[PDB]
Amino acid sequence: QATGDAICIFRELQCLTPRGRYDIRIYPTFLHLHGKTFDYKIPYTTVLRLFLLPHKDQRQMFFVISLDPPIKQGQTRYHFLILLFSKDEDISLTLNMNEEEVEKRFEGRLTKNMSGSLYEMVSRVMKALVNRKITVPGNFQGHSGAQCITCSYKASSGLLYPLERGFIYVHKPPVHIRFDEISFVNFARGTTTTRSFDFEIETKQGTQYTFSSIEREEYGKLFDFVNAKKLNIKNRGL
């Protein structure tokens, strides 16, 4: 329970990428992702984005850390650390420094002893350590009322989140596309099943991402969202 060199340690977190149970040890300039087999030291300067995303089931939360460069494990590359939390899990955290140092280091954002939901505590600590905002959903709401869309990417199914300034798909594999990177989007009829469509994104750098098998009922609100964000729909006739 003592944290030694570390400021604090989050133990036994469910990581989806990399997949497994990991501790996260917080240090001043990096976090140590400590697994039973592998270990990774991740400087805060390599954190590109932070996201806190509500799972469609209204019971879990994703915390996503986008990395640049990615972490390496043999030939595999992880461009994202994805943590999965139940909203009902709580944590009591004690920082391994005195009150004066906590105030000096974190400007009142943290205190030596803190309690709350585990996902909220991870977010609080990461925000204090990393010069990135906690990116959360904006005003998008789907046909059913959720803030994401069920779809397929590559060989698996997942969740597409229309955010204020980009799309993020989780979790296998994860993809983050900023709106400023998009050349155009396209809505295509789905071969897999009737009553579904594919949402294709073409980036300016010349790459295509297809989120497929989206229920037809989701079209209206995704169409309205893409228009509100000024993304070009190519094409509109046919």
Side-chain angles (χ1 to χ4, degrees), residues 127-217:
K127 179 70 222 86
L129 298 158
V130 180
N131 194 24
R132 302 298 189 190
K133 72 184 187 185
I134 307 302
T135 302
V136 298
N139 296 322
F140 177 82
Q141 296 193 237
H143 177 87
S144 82
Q147 295 161 111
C148 54
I149 303 163
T150 293
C151 60
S152 300
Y153 175 63
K154 313 294 287 164
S156 188
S157 179
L159 296 173
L160 178 68
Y161 289 83
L163 305 177
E164 182 180 328
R165 300 185 70 77
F167 292 106
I168 186 165
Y169 173 88
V170 298
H171 58 280
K172 183 179 195 181
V175 186
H176 178 222
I177 305 166
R178 307 180 254 122
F179 296 155
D180 72 292
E181 295 180 278
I182 293 181
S183 183
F184 61 86
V185 302
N186 182 56
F187 297 89
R189 293 243 191 96
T191 54
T192 306
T193 40
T194 64
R195 317 303 309 266
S196 77
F197 69 94
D198 299 347
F199 182 57
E200 294 169 354
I201 301 178
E202 169 87 5
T203 68
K204 298 183 184 168
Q205 295 297 321
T207 304
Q208 177 184 286
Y209 300 83
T210 303
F211 303 97
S212 53
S213 293
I214 299 174
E215 288 181 320
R216 169 66 202 194
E217 308 91 271

Side-chain angles (χ1 to χ4, degrees), residues 14-31:
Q14 189 184 357
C15 302
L16 310 183
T17 300
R19 190 193 197 186
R21 221 75 205 184
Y22 288 85
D23 298 348
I24 294 180
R25 312 183 181 174
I26 297 303
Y27 288 99
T29 71
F30 64 94
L31 65 83

Side-chain angles (χ1 to χ4, degrees), residues 28-45:
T29 71
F30 64 94
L31 65 83
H32 177 184
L33 193 60
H34 167 68
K36 34 177 84 72
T37 306
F38 305 111
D39 292 281
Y40 313 93
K41 299 215 289 182
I42 305 175
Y44 299 141
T45 57

Side-chain angles (χ1 to χ4, degrees), residues 52-62 84-91 116-120 147:
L52 186 57
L53 305 173
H55 203 296
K56 191 186 192 68
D57 63 23
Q58 305 307 312
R59 181 185 113 257
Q60 299 181 102
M61 303 292 304
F62 293 103
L84 183 61
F85 299 107
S86 176
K87 288 193 294 188
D88 77 338
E89 185 157 5
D90 299 332
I91 190 82
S117 69
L118 176 60
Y119 77 85
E120 178 219 46
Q147 295 161 111

